[PDB]
Design a protein around this nucleic acid. Sequence first.
RNA 1: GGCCAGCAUCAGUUUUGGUGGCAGGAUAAAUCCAUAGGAAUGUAGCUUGCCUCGGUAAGUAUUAUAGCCUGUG
RNA 2: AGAACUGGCGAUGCGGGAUGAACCGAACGUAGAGUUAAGGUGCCGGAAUACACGCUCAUCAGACACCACAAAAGGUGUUAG
RNA 3: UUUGCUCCACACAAUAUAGAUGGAUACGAAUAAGGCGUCCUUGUGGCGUCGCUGAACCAUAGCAGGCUACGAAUUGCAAUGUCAUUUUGCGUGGGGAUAAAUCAUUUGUAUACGACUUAGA
Lengths: 135, 171, 106, 189, 197
Amino acid sequence: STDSIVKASNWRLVEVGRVVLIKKGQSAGKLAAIVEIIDQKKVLIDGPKAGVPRQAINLGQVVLTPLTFALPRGARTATVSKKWAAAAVCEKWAASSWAKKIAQRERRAALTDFERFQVMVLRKQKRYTVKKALA
Amino acid sequence: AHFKEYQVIGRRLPTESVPEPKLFRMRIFASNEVIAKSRYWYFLQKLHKVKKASGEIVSINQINEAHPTKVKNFGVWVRYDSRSGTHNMYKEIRDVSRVAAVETLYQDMAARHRARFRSIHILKVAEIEKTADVKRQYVKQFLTKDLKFPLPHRVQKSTKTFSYKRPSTFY
Amino acid sequence: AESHRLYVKGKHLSYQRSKRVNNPNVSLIKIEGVATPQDAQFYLGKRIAYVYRASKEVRGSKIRVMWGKVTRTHGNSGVVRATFRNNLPAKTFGASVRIFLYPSNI
Amino acid sequence: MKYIQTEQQIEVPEGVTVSIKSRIVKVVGPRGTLTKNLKHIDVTFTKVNNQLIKVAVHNGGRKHVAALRTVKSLVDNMITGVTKGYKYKMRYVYAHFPINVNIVEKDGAKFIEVRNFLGDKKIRNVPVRDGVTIEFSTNVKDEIVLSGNSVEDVSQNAADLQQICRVRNKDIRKFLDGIYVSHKGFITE
Amino acid sequence: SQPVVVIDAKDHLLGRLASTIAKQVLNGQKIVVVRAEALNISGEFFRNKLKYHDFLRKATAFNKTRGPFHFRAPSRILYKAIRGMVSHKTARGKAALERLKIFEGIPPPYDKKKRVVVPQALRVLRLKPGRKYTTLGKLSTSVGWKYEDVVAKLEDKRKVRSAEYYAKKRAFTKKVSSASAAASESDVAKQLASFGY
RNA sequence: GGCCAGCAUCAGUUUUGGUGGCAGGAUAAAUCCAUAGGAAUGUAGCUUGCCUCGGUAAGUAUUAUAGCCUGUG
RNA sequence: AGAACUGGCGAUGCGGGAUGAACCGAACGUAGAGUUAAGGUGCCGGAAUACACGCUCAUCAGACACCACAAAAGGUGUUAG
RNA sequence: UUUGCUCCACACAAUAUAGAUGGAUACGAAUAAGGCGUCCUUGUGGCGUCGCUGAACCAUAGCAGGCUACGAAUUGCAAUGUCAUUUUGCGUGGGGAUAAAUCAUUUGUAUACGACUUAGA
């Protein structure tokens, strides 16, 4: 019959191969990947290319990104690096709107007064065109 | 606490009648050498005729884990004293290290039985090798194939007290 | 053009105190944006002014100033301590002082 | 122990459409439609086929996974109601005084009225629910037939009769009168 | 940082909001809680009603016009909760509570203004999903507040008049976004994006 | 000529950060590298009802078109 | 009601226990800076709506020992064994 | 007896601040769900996109901020280096408005006294 409309939610579910973003710790902001599952609350991760060590971390210090890839349960560091390089994760991440906003925050924080002034004069010119255009 | 594992060798003090007595060994969980050496003389003084004064400690060595980046199923045989009577228990844990399994065993024991460190004796810790001797469901439910699950209700932390948009719990 | 200021606004919360006892020699300042003792360590030594009004014009002004400085931090949420020449009057609990940047280390 | 995943399956028949959004279920079928608001239970419905629907609960505790099967049974009743209907049969029983039963339409909604309940003079009136269709037997004369889609209303309007036609300040071992449910079937089957 | 702070009290927890307030309004912020009838409080309705009845039980025997004045409205319930967190028997506390204004519904001066949210008091974040909570409107109406059916007739009106404003502003927003997107490729903007902007 | 401030260089008491070198441990353990053995939450591959190039399944198979574990060094 | 040992109050303020002659910490010249005790850090109230593993939903929950009350007997209510 | 009163314009004089000196920047409902854009067979629709903090958005250069459309130095190495915001009085000039209450007397639907209720050119 007519398609039974059923929608509730589609999650970033935790599983092997999932990429995570660490938000608190020595390795915050640096990416990693889940290898296997310790328990309901915590997991272990390994980010070799990002410089992360093989850890065992709670799920409060991480964030589950959408992107993911496929690797076997319990994989080792050299295997993880291989599969990461294969699936090209650090380019699929940088292309997101999330990562663009992160880099934007970092840039905006790393700015100096001269550049802050440059931005003011660059925005004056921009809204000048926009406000000549929208009337 | 932040536990550690120690290897304590001890020796009743030598005499002319027996100037090479028997070395007894214990593999103890504790936060530091001091209380490790205290617990050694607590357990040895339950089994053999010796004390700190009538004995000495030969070697005390930290045991680090061989494969701390490996998930393991630690079976644990323990005994604890309750308010009325003394009992034994077996519990399985799924942590990567012996010491971490102990750290989370003391905790959930104190939760579910209100038993303190001063009541518990850890008899045996065994890394189970195969996924067929596990008998506890709260472990077996993580030994499934293609295990995946979500975290439905997310709560973002806040450094500011006033926020100008209702939050979303979507993950 | 609309802004001319070179200070950071903060609030005079209270005096240093125990429970049931206070030390008016020392006052507590909440600075804006600060949330930790680290990142408040920047504001140490910085001068503070409480600017108020009075009806008797002295030296050609109705506004009057009480100066002081920031001495050290407070526990885990970006509060600091201050010590003025003449301690503050306790009706300023919840009043805006202004922290300058005059002794600088940038 | 908090579980990981606990699921149930629901077999949707043909010609029955199950529109779900924000736990507001809406089942449409040949007989009618039925809506339900399950916004007090934390549950995920996910469709796999037009032929069946999966419902799921995570992290459990023998409370959520207890209410999950309840939700399953509710939806199954909702689906069999719009197809096979529900048909309740309630029989009269009197020792001496015949229970004169009739239907009426007061200023407001329709009501069902009964008289001579043990030689009384009180006129016991009950409001028919908004969904039921209530009729009297024809192969026999001492039977009332409730019918509808919502069993949750049909059985309730049945129980209202059995509650108002109760015996008071007498012994119930002896005094057996009123209206009593005999059968709880479906319309077609 | 704002001079005045307007707080939507919908899906907020009572004490967890009132502590935040009672500190901010003592530190010197003028705070305006609004839409207090939709506040929430943990625990079940019958439980909260029992507690309110235990509060009503307490009245000065020899003259009950001296004692605990049992205010039945939600604004005044929250005021009680805050006043218990404040030293109202002093000038500090009195001045502080003069910096507060609580309302049921959203009146004119605060309907055309921006409302904020305290996240360390929100039910959806603090409470476990599945726990029972309680609504202050239903509670007050159960204990003798006679103006629930009025703020409702006013809030839907406010909402209609607000949704039309949004319906206009959304079209203006898409027009401005389509006018500004025609300059994003320009050297004035790809020179800004080198600075994050 | 003195009183009130500011700065610098110093002294005493103290607090808070950044950072370098060296030693010890199972001369850390691990990771990583080579090798032997083995297994399954069983990978290619092989018999497999159709069906998406063996999708499915239940058997086979111990690295093969994924990998893992243990030990040794 | 009557004794033993030590400690204290009485003769003794101070921080804490909301309050208290006796409890905990600690014994006092006048002041400054620093650090701590016992106790505490949602707000009143100076200080983390800090971190972590778990239990509990109570139609008179529970919450700083002395302390200001609670038993026997029961509950497939739940958790673990 | 416009000697008096009211509001407006400014010349201001005085007093007090529970304390801004860039902006209080507007949908609603759900959170085991939503927003935004678009297409249509306008539905609890299809597709796409977003969130993971407002760390945003807007405004923002110019003698405390100018003349045209040159000057700012010697406040001399820092000392609020004043513009806010109500109230009040006075004067200038522009209009506008022309009363009640209480006591005393009286009533008794009232009453310890006050008070209440009534009547009186």
